[PDB]
């Protein structure tokens, strides 16, 4: 029935036309399929998906950057990404990725200033959320400490 309808029109039976390239103006080999397909837009738009964070707020209990776009949050360098970096040899990247870029407060203020002075260098310290883990395990009956060097 479609063949019969096309042939009612003045269009080729196969439904494939020869097309000419817009750039070089020379014919295509092997005729291609054209027609009118009914297409739809979808409310997943780039200007509602794109997002970027350099320095914004910080969560309140574990001094880490917030999460989400409404809140001006940064991404979640997650557990399997930590595995990927461990799988590479990269270790300084991971250190700054979960000490300076994220948590340690003295660390990241000093890092921000070192940057705005042109001196790229980190000074780690200790993850504040780890300090919190100590406080909780210590609030239970248990006693976790940090032995002398």
């Amino acid at each position: 029935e479609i063949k019969e309808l096309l042939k009612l029109g003045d269009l080729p039976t196969s439904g494939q036309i020869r097309l000419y390239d817009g750039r070089t103006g020379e014919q295509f080999e092997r005729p291609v399929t054209v027609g009118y397909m009914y297409m739809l837009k979808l409310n997943h738009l780039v200007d509602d998906k794109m997002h970027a964070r350099s320095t914004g707020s910080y969560s309140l209990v574990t001094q880490q950057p917030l999460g989400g776009k409404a809140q001006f949050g940064g991404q979640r360098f997650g557990e399997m990404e930590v595995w990927a970096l461990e799988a590479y040899g990269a270790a300084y990247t991971l250190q700054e990725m979960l000490t300076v870029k994220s948590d340690d407060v003295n660390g990241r203020t000093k890092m921000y200033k070192n940057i705005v002075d042109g001196n790229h260098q980190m000074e780690p310290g200790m993850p504040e959320s780890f300090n919190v883990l100590l406080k909780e395990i210590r609030s239970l009956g248990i006693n976790i400490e940090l032995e002398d060097e």
Partner: protein
């Protein structure tokens, strides 16, 4: 007006969209034939026949 990608069809086994395309091309062919018969004014007996 839009270039899709052939290699997407026989993998994504939805052969339906290709027939949708052909049948749409038929529909628009009839549409342009009417458009010509209507631009060149054609003694509506002709429109009626077509």
């Amino acid at each position: 007006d839009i270039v899709l990608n052939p290699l997407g069809v026989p993998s994504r086994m939805n052969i339906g969209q290709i027939l949708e395309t052909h049948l749409g091309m038929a529909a628009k062919g009839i549409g342009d034939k009417i458009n010509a018969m209507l631009k060149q004014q054609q003694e509506v007996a002709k429109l009626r026949e077509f």
